[PDB]
Amino acid sequence: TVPTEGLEVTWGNNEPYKYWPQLSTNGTAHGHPHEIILYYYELYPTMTVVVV
Amino acid sequence: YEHVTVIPNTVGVPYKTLVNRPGYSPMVLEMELLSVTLEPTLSLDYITCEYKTVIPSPYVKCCGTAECKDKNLPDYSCKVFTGVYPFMWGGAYCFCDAENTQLSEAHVEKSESCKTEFASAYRAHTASASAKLRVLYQGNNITVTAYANGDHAVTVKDAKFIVGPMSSAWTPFDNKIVVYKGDVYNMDYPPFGAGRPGQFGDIQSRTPESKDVYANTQLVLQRPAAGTVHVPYSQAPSGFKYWLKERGASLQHTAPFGCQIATNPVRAVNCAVGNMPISIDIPEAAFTRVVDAPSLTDMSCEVPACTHSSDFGGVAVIKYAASKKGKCAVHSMTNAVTIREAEIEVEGNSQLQISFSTALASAEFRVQVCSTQVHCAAECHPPKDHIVNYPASHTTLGVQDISATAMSWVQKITGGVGLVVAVAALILIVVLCVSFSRH
Ligand SMILES: *[C@H]1O[C@H](CO[C@@H]2O[C@@H](C)[C@@H](O)[C@@H](O)[C@@H]2O)[C@@H](O[C@H]2O[C@H](CO)[C@@H](O[C@H]3O[C@H](CO[C@@H]4O[C@H](CO)[C@@H](O)[C@H](O)[C@@H]4O)[C@@H](O)[C@H](O[C@H]4O[C@H](CO)[C@@H](O)[C@H](O)[C@@H]4O)[C@@H]3O)[C@H](O)[C@H]2NC(C)=O)[C@H](O)[C@H]1NC(C)=O
Ligand SMILES: CC(C)CCC[C@@H](C)[C@H]1CC[C@H]2[C@@H]3CC=C4C[C@@H](O)CC[C@]4(C)[C@H]3CC[C@]12C
Numbered sequence: 001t002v003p004t005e006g007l008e009v010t011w012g013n014n015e016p017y018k019y020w021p022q023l024s025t026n027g028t029a030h031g032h033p034h035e036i037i038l039y040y041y042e043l044y045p046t047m048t049v050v051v052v
Numbered sequence: 053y054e055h056v057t058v059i060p061n062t063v064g065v066p067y068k069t070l071v072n073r074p075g076y077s078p079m080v081l082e083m084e085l086l087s088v089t090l091e092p093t094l095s096l097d098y099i100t101c102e103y104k105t106v107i108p109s110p111y112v113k114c115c116g117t118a119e120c121k122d123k124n125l126p127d128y129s130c131k132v133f134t135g136v137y138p139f140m141w142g143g144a145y146c147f148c149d150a151e152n153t154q155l156s157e158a159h160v161e162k163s164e165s166c167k168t169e170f171a172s173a174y175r176a177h178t179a180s181a182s183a184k185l186r187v188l189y190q191g192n193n194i195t196v197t198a199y200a201n202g203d204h205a206v207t208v209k210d211a212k213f214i215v216g217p218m219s220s221a222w223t224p225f226d227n228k229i230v231v232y233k234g235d236v237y238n239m240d241y242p243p244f245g246a247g248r249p250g251q252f253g254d255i256q257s258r259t260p261e262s263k264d265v266y267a268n269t270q271l272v273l274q275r276p277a278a279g280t281v282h283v284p285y286s287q288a289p290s291g292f293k294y295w296l297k298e299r300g301a302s303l304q305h306t307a308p309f310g311c312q313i314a315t316n317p318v319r320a321v322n323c324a325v326g327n328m329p330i331s332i333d334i335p336e337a338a339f340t341r342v343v344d345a346p347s348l349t350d351m352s353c354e355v356p357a358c359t360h361s362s363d364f365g366g367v368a369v370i371k372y373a374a375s376k377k378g379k380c381a382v383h384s385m386t387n388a389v390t391i392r393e394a395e396i397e398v399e400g401n402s403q404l405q406i407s408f409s410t411a412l413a414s415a416e417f418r419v420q421v422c423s424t425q426v427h428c429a430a431e432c433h434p435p436k437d438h439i440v441n442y443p444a445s446h447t448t449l450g451v452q453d454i455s456a457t458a459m460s461w462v463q464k465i466t467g468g469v470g471l472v473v474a475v476a477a478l479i480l481i482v483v484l485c486v487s488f489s490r491h
Contacts, residue, residue, distance in 0.1 A: 002439060010305065017441070023360055024438045029413045030431050030457040039434075040454075047451070 053339065055332045061088055061218070063322045065443055068394065070383045071334065077345035078423060079338075080381040080394050082188040083330065086195070089182045090320040092225050094174035096259070098244050100230075101166035102292045103255040103267060110276075110283050111155040112138060114148035118155040126255075126265040130157035131273050138281045145281075154276060156283040160267045162257060170260070171232045171252070171292065173241040174318075176225050181218050183328070188394065190338070191379070200328060212333040219326035224307040229318070235302030236313050247291070254291030346378040346398055348421055353428035355415075361435040362444040364392050364409040368428050370419065374398045380422040382406055387447055389417040396421070411446040413455035431456075 001007075006020040027038030040048045057069040063085050071079040111118055120130035136154040138145045146152075181200035186193060189209055196206040200216035226238040230252070239252070245266055247253025255267040274284040304313045311323045350373040358366040377399040384391045389410045396404050398421075406419065415430050454462070 006310075006443070008310065018443075019439050019441060020362065020444055022362055022435050022438060022440055023411065024436060025434050029434070029455045033461055036455070036458055036461075040458075051451070 053334045053336065055334065056329065057083075057332070058327045058329045059083060059085065061085065061326050061328055062324050062443070063088060065445065068383065068390070071332075073339050076339040076341055078381050078383070078420075079190075079334070080383050081332070082394050084186045085183055085328075086186055087184040088200075088322055088328075090179045090223055090323060091182070091317060092176045092179040092223060092319075094176060094229070094318060097173045097175060097241065098256045098258055099166070099170050099172050099260060100241075100252055100254075100256055100292055100295075101170045102163050102290050103160050103269065104163040105158060105160055105269075105271065105285065105287060107156075107158045107283055107285065110157075110281060112136070112145060112152075112281070113154070114146040114152040116151065117153045120155055120157060123159070125159040126161060127267040127269055127271055128157070128159035129271060129273060130155065132156075133275055136276060137278065138276075139279055156273050156276070158271055158273060158283070158285055160255065160265075160269050160271060162255060162265055166257075167260065169233075169292075171230050171295070174229050174231065176223075176227055176229055179221075179223055179225075179320075181216065183215060185213070185215065185330075187213065191395065210335050211338070214331050216328060218328050222309070222323070222325050224303060224309070224311045224313065224320050224323065225318070231315060231318060232296075232299075234315055235304055236315065236318055237299070237302050249291075250288040250294065251291055252295045254288070342423070346380055346422060347375050348372045348380070348398060348424050349374075351421070351424055351426035353419070353426045355428050355430035358408075358410070358415060358430045358432035359435055360411050360413065360432045360446070362409070362440060362442065362446065364407045364445065365435075366408050366410070366430070366432070368406050368408055368419070368430075369403050370406065370421070370426055370428070371401075371403050372398055372421070373401050382419060382421050384408075385418040385420055385425070386416070388412045388449065388453070389415060390446060391419065398422070409446045411449045412453055413458075 002019055002021050004021060006018060008016050008018050010016045023043050025039050025042040027042055028035040029039050053071065053073050055071050059067045066082055066084040068080060068082045071081065118132055120132065133154045133156065136152045137149055182198065183200050184197050186195050187208060189211065194208045196208055196213060198204045198206045198215045200218055202214065202217040205212050205214040225236060228239065228241055230237050230239045230241055242248065242253040244256060247256055247268055249268055249270045254269050255265060257265045269287050271285060271287045274286060276282060276284065307313060309323050309325055312321045314321060351370060353368060353370050355366060355368045379395050380398050381395055382391055382393055389408050392407045396406065398404060413432055415432060418425050418427050
């Protein structure tokens with residue numbers, strides 16, 4: 001699982017790998033209200049819910 | 053000119069700043085941290101090492117009693133056993149088969165290997181900060197190394213940079229550190245003079261060359277089995293050896309905040325906590341007068357494409373009209389949008405192109421080039437590759453910013469509710485007041 005701050009992974013004696021998430025979503029912005037709520041929900045799973 | 057800015061301690065991320073000196077063309081500097089180091093001051097308490105048990109030949113005295121006296125060795129005992137009748141390869145040890153005694157003794161001392169294989173127990177207190185900084189000054193990129201205490205100032209092309217002092221002092225190293233050959237482990241060393249048998253601390257010495265060794269290894273001598281000369285002993289196994297096998301994981305692999313811990317000297321590299329303030333003094337000579345510099349007029353902005361991705365997402369085309377051919381400076385005036393290109397070249401009437409990376413869904417950014425401000429607006433669509441291997445370059449986003457089509461729907465709904473409340477309130481106000489007039 002990848003944290004929003006990024007994840008570091010070390011495999012054996014190899015140099016460590018670093019990963020970061022992007023703000024990807026299956027929702028849309030600038031569209032219909034039911035498409036916009038999904039856009040923000042997926043990107044911000046906690047606050048979107050609290051604010052709404 | 054005195055200029056002060058603050059840059060986050062995240063390594064490998066460029067941040068940019070604008071120097072405002074009215075009457076002169078604006079200067080833009082780009083600075084990036086290449087490395088940040090925290091170097092703690094350590095004080096050695098003691099060294100833990102492997103011990104060896106020394107057992108000198110036994111003394112065999114037949115037809116008589118042997119005796120031994122106390123010695124001042126680190127861990128020593130002696131015992132005399134009676135009724136011993138040992139044999140040699142060629143027959144019984146001696147003529148006498150009665151009233152025989154044997155003296156056995158043993159002691160513990162540091163092995164010769166303690167000059168190569170050892171763990172040092174240190175106390176930690178405070179740490180000095182330093183950093184490797186790369187600053188783009190007028191189109192040259194110069195690299196400067198400075199302490200971040202706030203006490204070192206470095207000279208780049210006749211300009212003064214005084215890095216520091218760091219905002220927060222979280223240090224990965226804890227209060228007590230045990231350092232083996234290559235890695236630092238946070239642990240609570242047992243205090244000097246109190247090591248329990250069989251764990252870290254069975255044999256402890258104050259300095260590598262010191263001759264005072266305190267060892268509590270439980271050596272108890274035992275009776276020689278009949279028919280032989282062996283001097284049997286029972287001892288807990290070496291403490292250091294057991295720690296080496298069951299070490300756990302060193303701080304380098306388990307520290308918080310992405311630190312890398314390296315040794316000789318013990319140091320922490322690239323920890324991402326806090327903001328390091330940078331203050332720059334720029335000599336008056338470098339600044340260039342407004343009249344000499346190119347001046348830009350008639351600017352309009354159209355954003356062909358926007359994608360909110362960590363890498364530089366969108367291109368913006370800006371149309372400029374310029375007095376003369378010269379270098380010019382570009383800087384965003386809103387925090388969210390960051391513009392990759394510091395300087396672009398302008399001539400005649402043409403289009404300049406700047407690349408922007410942002411995390412804002414609908415973007416409203418004012419970009420200023422050579423003292424004129426042009427406003428650019430666009431709609432951004434989300435990125436479709438889920439995980440990337442490079443650090444995020446856009447700054448973070450806050451609840452203030454919601455997308456434009458989002459705002460409109462919020463305003464309308466909230467407004468509709470508000471009107472209903474207001475109409476209702478007016479009705480109450482009227483009825484209540486009329487009732488007061490009525491008697
Ligand atoms: C002073 O330094 C600027 C940045 O300094 C860089 O890092 C410093 C710590 C130091 O090491 C310094 O020496 C480095 O130059 C520098 O501006 C530059 O910034 C870019 C990095 O941000 C840099 O790199 C790119 O350019 C290539 C095209 O050139 C290729 O480079 C490859 C190695 O990366 C070679 O193998 C090729 O033969 C070829 O020369 C792009 O293609 C790169 O993107 C692609 O590369 C990455 C891996 O690096 C891959 O994953 C992908 O294919 C990716 O798409 C990358 O963008 C540029 O050299 C340069 N960019 C400019 C000109 O804006 C300047 O030299 C200087 N300051 C300025 C701004 O003048
Ligand atoms: C159109 C109707 C259904 C109302 C829609 C409300 C939407 C547009 C509002 C309500 C909740 C809001 C979100 C609440 C919390 C956050 C997390 C913050 O870090 C970024 C802003 C963000 C993501 C807000 C974005 C816009 C938002 C999703």
